[PDB]
Amino acid sequence: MHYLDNLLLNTDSYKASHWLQYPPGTDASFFYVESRGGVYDQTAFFGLQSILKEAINRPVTHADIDDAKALLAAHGEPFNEAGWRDIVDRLGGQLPIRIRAVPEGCVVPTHNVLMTIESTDAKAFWVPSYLETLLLRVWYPVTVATVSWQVKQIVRDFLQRTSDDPEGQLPFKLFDFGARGVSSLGSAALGGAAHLVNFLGTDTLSALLLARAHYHTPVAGYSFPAAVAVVSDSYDIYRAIREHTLREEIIASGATVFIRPDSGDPVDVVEQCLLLLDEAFGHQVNGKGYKVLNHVRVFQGDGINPQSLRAILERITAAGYAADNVAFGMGGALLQKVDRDTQKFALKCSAVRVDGAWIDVYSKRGRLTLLRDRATGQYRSALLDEVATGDSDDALVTVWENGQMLREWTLEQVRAHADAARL
Amino acid sequence: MHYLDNLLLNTDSYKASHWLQYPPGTDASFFYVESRGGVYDQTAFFGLQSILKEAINRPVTHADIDDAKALLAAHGEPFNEAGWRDIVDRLGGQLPIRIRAVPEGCVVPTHNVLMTIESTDAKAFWVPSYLETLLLRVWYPVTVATVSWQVKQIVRDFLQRTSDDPEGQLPFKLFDFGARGVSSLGSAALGGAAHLVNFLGTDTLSALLLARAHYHTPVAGYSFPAAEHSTITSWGREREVDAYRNMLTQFARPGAIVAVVSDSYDIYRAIREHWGTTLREEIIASGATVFIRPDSGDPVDVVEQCLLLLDEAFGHQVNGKGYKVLNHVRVFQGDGINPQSLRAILERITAAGYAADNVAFGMGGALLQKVDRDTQKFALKCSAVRVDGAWIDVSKRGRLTLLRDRATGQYRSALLDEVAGDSDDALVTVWENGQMLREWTLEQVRAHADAARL
């Protein structure tokens, strides 16, 4: 934990010597962050707040410069000792950058400006590029939140078709079990938090801690206890029904027994357990005309991904069973099987000021922002010189400037913005 | 950082309530960790030491029990306050387990015991199950160390065939630059170190920090300065020569390595248009090694294409193997590199007559991020529990260890009751009851891994 407490060493090695590459007379730089495309056409922005709280949690000190100058020397990189000491002494160790971003939770289509980073000091103009490495890692919470959100839209579709209470049923249909299948503890926390943007169920306790620490939400999610959750193979409802009357506390305690298989094809086993359970406890028909099992539910934790989950939901509703009957769990397929290429996540330089003049660097160019249309709500990237010309708002807000986080969200605010977005 | 400082909450939610599901009269549990196949047939064991140093860094406190009791109650899971308060009171907050593992760096064939966790107390027999979630995440440093190692064996082959100094050329052939394409800071550090088991090149500074903090290696890796393509452009189309000229002015010192970026078509232009014919100055005059990194073209072709273009611009010498080695310049390919594409490049350029010395690789997301727990089908399984003083079994069953054959050096899993001769127990007790009994320097880790071949 404490051995990583040096912001000056939280970058790519070649960044320590990057300021020497600028043309003479540079005094400002402007960067933006976009998803160039990939699996989905829209991304739920989330995570930057957690990143800034943890990666930039205190002013840079002279001890930071001392330790970094030593290592980077031995490591093989020139290090701007003058510029960093100037930041500690002149700017009080507060990074001279301004970060604007779309509110965390908003779902924005790809190829659009999600963040902008701009230097606020002429001497330390190079600080944005230095911070590119740790800021670009916002791809991960963004990408996980998008996955959990895209899955939410699949279940919302089927609940709306087959459930008498879709929006009540929905927040408990995806549980994150990915703590063991993720690359590190911090990734479990942050990534697990990205899932909590869309659902209330998670077994990643580390997501609870980060949500409370970085988003002011004490108990952001709930979980499943087992021993009512019970494990099975699919062929034990097959057995215990007609090779018996284990209707012992199931009907007597009146509890909701969640039957979870762990073997078989994710689509077939779910339909099998539904049918078997229907022949063991009966069912009732809701207002939509779909059957809802009595007491028993099915939980599928194995083999769930967005495509296999849609397959399951298609099969069971065509059989006449409401989406209320099942719930899903995703583990590694939610927190680990994603990368920066999944949504083609980039941080691009768009503008530098050289000799008092801004010049374009080149997909998008110049000093940019995100606009939201007042009537339709649709998004489009545009230049800062275009916020004046009125049936449009600047969709970004300054969240961080010169050491002070200017805008914070609660996880409930984030959940609100994600839940309003559909499709 | 500090908000995670509670071991009691570093697990799956249902694992906090797992002690309720043992039979009555249980007084011991025994678990093992294996890779049950996957992409590769062998895995380089690494990372467990860092995991234990960071995840278990202090005794369990009563405050920890207070917070975990409160949260798990609101969250919806039973929490064994009784067992944990007894551990803090009686066992001084020291986890009553013993962890044995193969020495970090060893490359072990899949389907073999790599770790064993056993309880050392009759009351707190369930502690291993509780620690399963954090321990199983050893899949990540094992998988990344294996990936870097499998790539090393590929480069070793073509260096052995085409280079006059293979083992000297090898440790700088794969640079990890994936600090930006990894899921978090902690994964960057631990993952970057897993790659440092096999190579000396990295831009992941956080790997240096973890290697210094958890593996007693002060400066475990080295880097060179490299030209960013966005920054060169800012100089303007007019002063584009002057950008590279300054690039050499800052970093191109005699024994130094400097990396510049261009495309397939600029090197083509520079040669037969003479626009930068003045630019062979202080590439040659500096005596530095200028790495040319492409940003356009097919990842396999641009390597050979740059080699040929550079072969004209700077000439070459023919080594003892008969393979050409460019003067001053080298090629660095960081885009699209994976074990199979890297093998493709080396196949192409050597068949063209160029020694593997000419090229060097960087991997980003494909090394630190494009891996999962299924990559090596990594498992943690209970194999034995003691019930009423009697051990009962739960691929493998019973209480297990790893054996290495004295003559061949081959590995096989076996029962503890079977160390009866001409084989040594390949495991060592690294952690027991709060004490880390064995630690390794990264160089000790590097030594074990470098000896394994194929």
Residue numbers in the entry:
A (entry chain B): 1 to 227, 258 to 274, 278 to 395, 406 to 432, 435 to 468
B (entry chain A): 1 to 394, 406 to 431, 435 to 468
Quoted from the paper:
To completely block the tunnel, which had a large diameter, we made multiple substitutions using bulky aromatic residues simultaneously. The crystal structure of this quadruple mutant was determined (3.11 Å), which confirmed that the tunnel had been successfully blocked. By comparing the structure of the mutant with that of the NAMPT-NAM complex, we discovered that the presence of the aromatic side chain of Phe 224 caused a conflict with the NAM molecule bound within the tunnel. Consistent with the positively cooperative model and the existence of two NAM binding sites, the hill coefficient of the quadruple mutant dropped to 1.00, indicating a loss of positive cooperativity after blocking the tunnel. However, the quadruple mutant with blocked tunnel was significantly less sensitive to FK866 inhibition, exhibiting an IC50 value of 153.54 nM, which is more than 600-fold higher than that of the wild-type enzyme.
Nicotinamide phosphoribosyltransferase (NAMPT) plays an important role in the biosynthesis of nicotinamide adenine dinucleotide (NAD+) via the nicotinamide (NAM) salvage pathway.
